[PDB]
């Protein structure tokens, strides 16, 4: 909680997706994202039922 935001290598498209309208400014902040897990048995294991 008390750290510097430490910007990543993941890029977020700040698209000035403006409009016809001369008064709005209409920004978008959009990112596509995938979490490929090579070697599913190696990559992730789950202890599924913890009591809290």
């Amino acid at each position: 909680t008390g750290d510097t935001p430490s910007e990543s290598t993941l890029w977020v498209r700040l698209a000035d997706v403006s409009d016809e309208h001369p008064d709005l400014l209409k920004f978008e902040l959009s990112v596509a994202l995938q979490l490929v897990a090579f070697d599913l048995i190696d990559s992730i294991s789950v202890i599924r039922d913890i009591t809290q």
């Binding site: 016809e20 309208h21 001369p22 008064d23 709005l24």
Partner: protein, 52 residues
């Protein structure tokens, strides 16, 4: 005359009526203001000869 509409800062860009140029058209009339006279050629030489 074109009509000015109203909208809020962010209001929707509606469209409003426009100043209408109408084509006015007269014409030099097909009717003359003629005045014409059949001066007898005798009353020309005569009047020149005896004209007070």
């Amino acid at each position: 005359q074109g009509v000015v509409g109203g909208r809020t800062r962010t209001g929707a860009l509606a469209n409003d009526t426009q100043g209408t140029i109408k084509g006015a058209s007269l014409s030099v009339p097909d009717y003359y203001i003629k005045h014409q006279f059949d001066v007898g050629k005798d009353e020309i030489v005569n009047s020149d000869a005896t004209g007070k």
